[PDB]
Amino acid sequence: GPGMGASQDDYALIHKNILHSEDLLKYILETSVYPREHEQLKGLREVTEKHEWSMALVAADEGLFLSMLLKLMNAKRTIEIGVYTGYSLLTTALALPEDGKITAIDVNKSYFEIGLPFIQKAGVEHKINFIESEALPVLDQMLQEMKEEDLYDFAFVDADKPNYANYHERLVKLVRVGGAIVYDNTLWFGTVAFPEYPGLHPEEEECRVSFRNLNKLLAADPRVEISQVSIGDGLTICRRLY
Amino acid sequence: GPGMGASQDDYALIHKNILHSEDLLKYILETSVYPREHEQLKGLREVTEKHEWSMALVAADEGLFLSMLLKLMNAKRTIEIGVYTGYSLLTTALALPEDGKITAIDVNKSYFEIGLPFIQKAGVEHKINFIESEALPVLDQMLQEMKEEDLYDFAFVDADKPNYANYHERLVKLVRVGGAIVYDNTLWFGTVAFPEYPGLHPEEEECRVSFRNLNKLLAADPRVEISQVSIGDGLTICRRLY
Numbered sequence: 001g002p003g004m005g006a007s008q009d010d011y012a013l014i015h016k017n018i019l020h021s022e023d024l025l026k027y028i029l030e031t032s033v034y035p036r037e038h039e040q041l042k043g044l045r046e047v048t049e050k051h052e053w054s055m056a057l058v059a060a061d062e063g064l065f066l067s068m069l070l071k072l073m074n075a076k077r078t079i080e081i082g083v084y085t086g087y088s089l090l091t092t093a094l095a096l097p098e099d100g101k102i103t104a105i106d107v108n109k110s111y112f113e114i115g116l117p118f119i120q121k122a123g124v125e126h127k128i129n130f131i132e133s134e135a136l137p138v139l140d141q142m143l144q145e146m147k148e149e150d151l152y153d154f155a156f157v158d159a160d161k162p163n164y165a166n167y168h169e170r171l172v173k174l175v176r177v178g179g180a181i182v183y184d185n186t187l188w189f190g191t192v193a194f195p196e197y198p199g200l201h202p203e204e205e206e207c208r209v210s211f212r213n214l215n216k217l218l219a220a221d222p223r224v225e226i227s228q229v230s231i232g233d234g235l236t237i238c239r240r241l242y
Numbered sequence: 243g244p245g246m247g248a249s250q251d252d253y254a255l256i257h258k259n260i261l262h263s264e265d266l267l268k269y270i271l272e273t274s275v276y277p278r279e280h281e282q283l284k285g286l287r288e289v290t291e292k293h294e295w296s297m298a299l300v301a302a303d304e305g306l307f308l309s310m311l312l313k314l315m316n317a318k319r320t321i322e323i324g325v326y327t328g329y330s331l332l333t334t335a336l337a338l339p340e341d342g343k344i345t346a347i348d349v350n351k352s353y354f355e356i357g358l359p360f361i362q363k364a365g366v367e368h369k370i371n372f373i374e375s376e377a378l379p380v381l382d383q384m385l386q387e388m389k390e391e392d393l394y395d396f397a398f399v400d401a402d403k404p405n406y407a408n409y410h411e412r413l414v415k416l417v418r419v420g421g422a423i424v425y426d427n428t429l430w431f432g433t434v435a436f437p438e439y440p441g442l443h444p445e446e447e448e449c450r451v452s453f454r455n456l457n458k459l460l461a462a463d464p465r466v467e468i469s470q471v472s473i474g475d476g477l478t479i480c481r482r483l484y
């Protein structure tokens with residue numbers, strides 16, 4: 001209702017980690033991430049750390065992993081669902097070749113405007129077509145229009161978590177055979193390991209349930225092969241088989 | 243040489259995990275790994291779990307991730323350093339195309355022969371050239387024989403951990419530009435996060451120190467891009483830049 005509105009301080013999970021200790025995560029970041037992080041990614045991360053929804057920001061070690069996957073697979077055309085201030089988007093744009101093209105979809109362009117100056121300074125704004133919309137209608141329109149020559153090599157899904165299974169039904173048609181779909185947050189702070197988890201905000205509980213269902217669906221889906229990876233808050237890589 | 247025992251039972255870290263939640267690791271395996279694990283990988287894993295060096299067996303979630311990398315990068319020729327009973331090796335042979343080729347190097351052929359019946363039943367023994375040797379002399383001979391056109395697409399390094407930096411100096415010349423070198427165990431049970439860590443066997447302490455040194459070296463090495471990934475016992479993916 002009216003009042004102060006939603007704050008990440010209403011959530012129960014924000015200080016949880018999947019790694020053994022905060023010391024281990026800090027070691028990875030300080031040793032293997034920050035020395036390899038573009039100046040503009042550092043600037044975008046530091047501003048975003050102060051933002052009211054900072055809990056949503058993709059982890060920086062996960063960012064370098066996404067970059068590595070895009071390069072090893074020679075991705076050129078990609079889609080991102082859930083942009084926020086742009087950390088995964090800028091990571092992706094820096095990883096792609098000069099002629100790479102990203103379709104980036106988010107319901108709230110004001111978040112993207114926080115990252116836009118960093119993206120511009122990095123020299124990669126030309127690779128990004130940002131669309132301000134709920135993602136499902138955009139994907140459904142794409143399914144009417146896109147031809148084989150326009151299929152995506154890679155999709156990163158990091159938007160509203162309860163809709164991931166709906167996004168999957170479109171993305172297995174929009175990403176080429178042999179292409180990759182990466183779903184972020186599939187371990188949901190560790191809560192997915194429990195059939196009940198006390199004290200969660202109703203939105204957090206909804207995502208525990210939706211991720212438990214999604215993880216079973218993806219493990220059973222013959223259209224993809226999968227790898228669930230315990231980096232960040234968990235992610236699942238899907239490769240389209242047919 | 244004379245000294246103290248260094249069998250698995252002499253080590254302190256066997257049961258320590260990089261994830262804090264044993265329930266979360268089991269959830270990943272039961273939900274996203276075992277339903278996707280080839281029958282012959284299951285059989286090879288089950289025998290290896292009973293073997294006296296079971297702690298060295300690659301994690302099964304990590305196996306599916308290595309398979310995913312190999313397929314997404316369209317690897318065809320690969321090298322494996324440290325085979326043990328063959329779990330990563332069989333994972334790799336299943337992932338590669340029918341005409342794929344693996345050079346697999348281990349000092350102990352008897353360990354390989356434990357896994358070999360499972361590899362044979364999977365129909366992929368023909369992709370594997372197993373070399374019974376210490377790896378460093380094999381790599382040095384390869385430097386003298388290899389042509390640019392036969393460089394490997396992918397190397398998995400999982401042998402004697404203190405020698406990884408020595409292996410790296412050869413592998414950056416034996417993997418193609420754009421190819422991948424994956425170093426296993428680069429988080430060493432999480433002990434790398436600490437400048438001092440009491441209660442280790444001397445060989446475990448040697449690896450903590452050698453991984454702390456390697457992780458700094460790789461983060462500073464301009465010949466590669468890197469991503470350290472907190473899956474299994476940690477691994478670092480390197481992509482050769484020039």
Ligand SMILES: Nc1ncnc2c1ncn2[C@@H]1O[C@H](CSCC[C@H](N)C(=O)O)[C@@H](O)[C@H]1O
Nearest residue numbers: 056057058082084088106107134135159160
């Ligand atoms: N239905 C929907 N369609 C598209 N975007 C949505 C959406 N519901 C929520 N979002 C957006 O999903 C984003 C989730 S956070 C994305 C994090 C970002 N990828 C990073 O690298 O840090 C938010 O910006 C939010 O506005």
Ligand SMILES: Nc1ncnc2c1ncn2[C@@H]1O[C@H](CSCC[C@H](N)C(=O)O)[C@@H](O)[C@H]1O
Nearest residue numbers: 298299300324326330348349376377401402
């Ligand atoms: N100098 C050396 N050269 C090659 N192999 C070595 C070596 N020193 C030890 N090894 C081998 O390194 C292996 C480490 S365990 C390898 C695990 C395996 N990749 C898996 O997927 O489970 C052992 O089999 C050991 O015999």
Ligand SMILES: [Mg+2]
Nearest residue numbers: 058158184185
């Ligand atoms: Mg996320």
Ligand SMILES: [Mg+2]
Nearest residue numbers: 300400426427
């Ligand atoms: Mg290992």
